[PDB]
Amino acid sequence: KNPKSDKFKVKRFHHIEFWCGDATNVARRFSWGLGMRFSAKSDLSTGNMVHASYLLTSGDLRFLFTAPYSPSLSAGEIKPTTTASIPSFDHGSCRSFFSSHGLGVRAVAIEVEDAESAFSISVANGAIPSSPPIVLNEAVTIAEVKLYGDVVLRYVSYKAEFLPGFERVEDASSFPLDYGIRRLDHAVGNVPELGPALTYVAGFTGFHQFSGLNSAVLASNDEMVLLPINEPVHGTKRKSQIQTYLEHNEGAGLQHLALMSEDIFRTLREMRKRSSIGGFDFMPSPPPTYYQNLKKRVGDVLSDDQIKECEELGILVDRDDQGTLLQIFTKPLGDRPTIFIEIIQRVGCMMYQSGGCGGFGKGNFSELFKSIEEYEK
Amino acid sequence: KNPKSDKFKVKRFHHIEFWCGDATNVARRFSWGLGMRFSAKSDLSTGNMVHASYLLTSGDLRFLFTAPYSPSLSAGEIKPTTTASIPSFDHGSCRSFFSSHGLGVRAVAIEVEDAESAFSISVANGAIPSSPPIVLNEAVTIAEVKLYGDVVLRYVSYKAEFLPGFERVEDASSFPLDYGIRRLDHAVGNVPELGPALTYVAGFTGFHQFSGLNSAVLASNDEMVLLPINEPVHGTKRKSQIQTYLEHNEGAGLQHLALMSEDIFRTLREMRKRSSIGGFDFMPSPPPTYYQNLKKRVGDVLSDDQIKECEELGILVDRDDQGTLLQIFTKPLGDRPTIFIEIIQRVGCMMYQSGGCGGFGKGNFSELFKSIEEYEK
Numbered sequence A, B: 001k002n003p004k005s006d007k008f009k010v011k012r013f014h015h016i017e018f019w020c021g022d023a024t025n026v027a028r029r030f031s032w033g034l035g036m037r038f039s040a041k042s043d044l045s046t047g048n049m050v051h052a053s054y055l056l057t058s059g060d061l062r063f064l065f066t067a068p069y070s071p072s073l074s075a076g077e078i079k080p081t082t083t084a085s086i087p088s089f090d091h092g093s094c095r096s097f098f099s100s101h102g103l104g105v106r107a108v109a110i111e112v113e114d115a116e117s118a119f120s121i122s123v124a125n126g127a128i129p130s131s132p133p134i135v136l137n138e139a140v141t142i143a144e145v146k147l148y149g150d151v152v153l154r155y156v157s158y159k160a161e162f163l164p165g166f167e168r169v170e171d172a173s174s175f176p177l178d179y180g181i182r183r184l185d186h187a188v189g190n191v192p193e194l195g196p197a198l199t200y201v202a203g204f205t206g207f208h209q210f211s212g213l214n215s216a217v218l219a220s221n222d223e224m225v226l227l228p229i230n231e232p233v234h235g236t237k238r239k240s241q242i243q244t245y246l247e248h249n250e251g252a253g254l255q256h257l258a259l260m261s262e263d264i265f266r267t268l269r270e271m272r273k274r275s276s277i278g279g280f281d282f283m284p285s286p287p288p289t290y291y292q293n294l295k296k297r298v299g300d301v302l303s304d305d306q307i308k309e310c311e312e313l314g315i316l317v318d319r320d321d322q323g324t325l326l327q328i329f330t331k332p333l334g335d336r337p338t339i340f341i342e343i344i345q346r347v348g349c350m351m352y353q354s355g356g357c358g359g360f361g362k363g364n365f366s367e368l369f370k371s372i373e374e375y376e377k
């Protein structure tokens, strides 16, 4: 069922913004590890005395990395005269965010028809406002409301290239890395209580509903903006990792970003080649039992060679009633066991491919729990 | 002249510690960009609930990267019961350092005969104490005094492997990168006033003295611990970059680290291959005039091919009366135009090679100023 109740016209995931202490180092690391090009910058060299922001790009995927300069550089400025290209930025909020959370996502940004309207309707409908609609160079409108913890849902809309005040990067420094990642599939929040988070967020967007945890997935009208939310289940055999997140994150925040690849096998080869030379590490590979059992559930979907490749790469495969999902999880992206990344590719549900095709891996909890057990053997 | 007045027995540069907001991302970036192995860690996986610290290594060069976890993780601890492997660490000092300076060096560490003695004698001789001598597992003694700004000079001594509480890293994650860098040659501070900084530091160590700026170089008995210090010259034609450092750094701090390579040509090839894929950028290359003029000053030292290689790589060459110096400078290592790195190799002064052989590049100010001018042509 899909009531299509979006209170305003939502288009797609536009970009994800990380709040860092040093944007250069994180961005350069992410670029290498994930195969993302350097596309745009806003910093001293572009006249921004407030924050340093570097945009990484792979297909439609836009990762933004932002860190504050010294407040001294812009002490003579006020908001009317600001040189920051993202007017919602605030030294104190940024430093406080990073001190409280470490490296993490500050904004999940979606493109909408009209960001001023989407903010008004949102706030009229329960959203806690975070930064009011501001119009940049009469060309783009940006607005922010609280999503969960210190993560904001950021609305962006264009009259008619990322943002005003950004510049396209020197082609010399923009080496065309690409490991196959194409767009953001979903962005997942961890909260201490699912119900109120859902009710709050579903309340002001109109989005509809699509082991260690309980979770639920909110989705826009065409189900291409997918916002799962997790909560822990306490008392369990092995401690809830949603709880471990909340402890080390100092509260709710973004847990993981799921990035769609147009060739999950090439992506995972390319990322794993780089795991130990600056890139990202992947979760431990499941035992061969998980892959012996793969034939009986997806043998009609992937060849034995395609299945053998999965085993080389530690890829996970799950299937619902509409499609098949290939997925894998990185280890945490930073010092803390908090945010991580998921690499995704979906097969099926073509009419284009509809969102969520294959689910989010629900069946892999049972398949792993079992295959762990039948591997002791 | 070398009076050899060290007030205590200094051995060599032991390690450099960066204070970061996220140690993983900086370290992984530095590893790739500079060809440094992952050698040791102290973090949650080793039971450290206080800070995350990762050691990178290339030859004798030891870069340490440290970031704080949430103070909540260790709220029940006191200094006697601490789980931090570096007992001088302090969340508040670290967060304050990084908020004030961004990514930068917190400690310049030298190995000494006896760190307890070196601290006492230092403090008896004017040093502002920063962390008193602490003995770790009855095996290593560490102590800290203020060097300049918020940079500490850290004494380390061993009775008899980096530090207690660190673990050697999984050989799977320890890929043996190596671009030829072998040790730290000198670590340079920028201060607003040279005289008092010199007098202070020479005062408590016994170290002796070895455009935009004035500078002077302090050195231990065998001149293998070299600590230049810069100050600006105001009013000049083009603004002092020592001043630009002080403005963007919020005061004095470490300006650059000069790393010795056993093959500056292979290092610079390897680092430049990686400049645009996660590594480090290098300063703009000098005009061909600088290389046409190279033959007449170092043509007795490097072949025409060796000189041609220099031109490919942007290498700078200078010469004093004892030896020849090959050097190049990176662009800043982080968001701010503050700390950068210098790649060095020295030819001459063999008896072993004596420290400082070839100087620090003094002659290259004139040679560049000129070659810029004779290139307009």
Ligand SMILES: Cn1c(=O)n(-c2ccc(Cl)cc2)c(=O)c2cc([N+](=O)[O-])c(C(=O)C3=C(O)CCCC3=O)cc21
Residues within 6 Å of the ligand: A186, A188, A215, A216, A217, A228, A229, A230, A255, A256, A316, A327, A342, A360, A361, A362, A364, A365, A368, A369
């Ligand atoms: C597939 N999968 C998985 O297999 N394991 C796993 C690993 C090892 C062992 Cl032994 C057993 C199970 C996970 O732990 C796991 C955790 C998460 N998560 O925390 O969100 C997700 C996930 O992506 C997700 C949700 O579950 C519901 C909300 C939508 C959503 O996106 C998927 C997971």
Ligand SMILES: Cn1c(=O)n(-c2ccc(Cl)cc2)c(=O)c2cc([N+](=O)[O-])c(C(=O)C3=C(O)CCCC3=O)cc21
Residues within 6 Å of the ligand: B186, B188, B215, B216, B217, B228, B229, B230, B255, B256, B316, B327, B342, B360, B361, B362, B364, B365, B368, B369
């Ligand atoms: C060699 N050299 C250089 O050529 N230029 C340069 C670049 C481009 C143009 Cl056009 C003209 C000149 C520098 O700016 C420069 C700056 C520094 N520094 O700031 O310390 C150093 C340096 O390493 C150093 C000192 O100078 C004295 C204390 C010991 C020490 O280590 C060397 C430099």
Ligand SMILES: [Co+2]
Residues within 6 Å of the ligand: A186, A188, A256, A258, A342, A360
């Ligand atoms: Co997921």
Ligand SMILES: [Co+2]
Residues within 6 Å of the ligand: B186, B188, B256, B258, B342, B360
């Ligand atoms: Co130097």
